[PDB]
Design a protein around this ligand. Structure first.
Ligand SMILES: COc1cccc(CNC(=O)c2nc3ccc(F)c(OCCc4ccc(C(=O)O)cc4)c3c(=O)[nH]2)c1
Ligand SMILES: [Ca+2]
Ligand SMILES: [Ca+2]
Ligand code: NA
Ligand SMILES: [Zn+2]
Ligand SMILES: [Zn+2]
Length: 170
């Protein structure tokens, strides 16, 4: 027999993702690099593996859309809601949607796609918001002007509570 897990998590370490469509704001390559770096935030501190799919059905379908885009969470135009992701599960589970009425960047201008993606992928993986104002998973987007991204210890503890640490060295 099997009882349901205590927490929403993926029951597999090998996850797939697909970039379904792209924002006008950035190149395909900038967008791919941003999502790849954002997934690496999480895979670097767990046993999670992320494989990009070019088509078909991935665990984490990523898309850019505006207003009503096929769920109960319509976007709201410029500013306000930025993005959202669904917790682990079938179908819409794990999917991450980015509001394409925002300006997405690879800088401190607009909203940094890597930074918001890393945060959305936290949700895609089972993390909700943290009270730690320094946390990646803090509910309010701020861009610190840090040159170097470092996953805060709060988010490390959170994600490792779900998936364990993976290799504690490289
Ligand atoms: C939709 O809601 C949200 C969406 C996102 C975040 C949040 C909440 N969390 C934050 O705002 C936040 N968490 C951090 C945690 C650790 C860090 F290191 C940080 O600085 C990294 C800077 C940096 C940015 C970009 C590059 C690049 O492009 O490589 C390199 C470095 C930050 C940070 O700046 N902000 C809410
Ligand atoms: Ca999914
Ligand atoms: Ca918006
Ligand atoms: Na946009
Ligand atoms: Zn959505
Ligand atoms: Zn969030």
């Amino acid at each position: 027999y099997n009882v349901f897990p205590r927490t929403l998590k993926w029951s597999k370490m090998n996850l797939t993702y697909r970039i379904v469509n792209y924002t006008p704001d950035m190149t395909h390559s900038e967008v791919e690099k941003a999502f790849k770096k954002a997934f690496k935030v999480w895979s670097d501190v767990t046993p999670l593996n992320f494989t990009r799919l070019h088509d078909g059905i991935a665990d984490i379908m990523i898309s850019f859309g505006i207003k009503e885009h096929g769920d109960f969470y319509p976007f709201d135009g410029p500013s306000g809601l930025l993005a959202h992701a669904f917790p682990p599960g079938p179908n819409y589970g794990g999917d991450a949607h980015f509001d394409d009425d925002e300006t997405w960047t690879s800088s401190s201008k607009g909203y940094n796609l890597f930074l918001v993606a890393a945060h959305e992928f936290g949700h895609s993986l089972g993390l909700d918001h943290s009270k730690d104002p320094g946390a990646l998973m803090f509910p309010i987007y701020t861009y610190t002007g840090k040159s170097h991204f470092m996953l805060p210890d709060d988010d490390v503890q959170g994600i490792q509570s779900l998936y364990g640490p993976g290799d504690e060295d490289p």
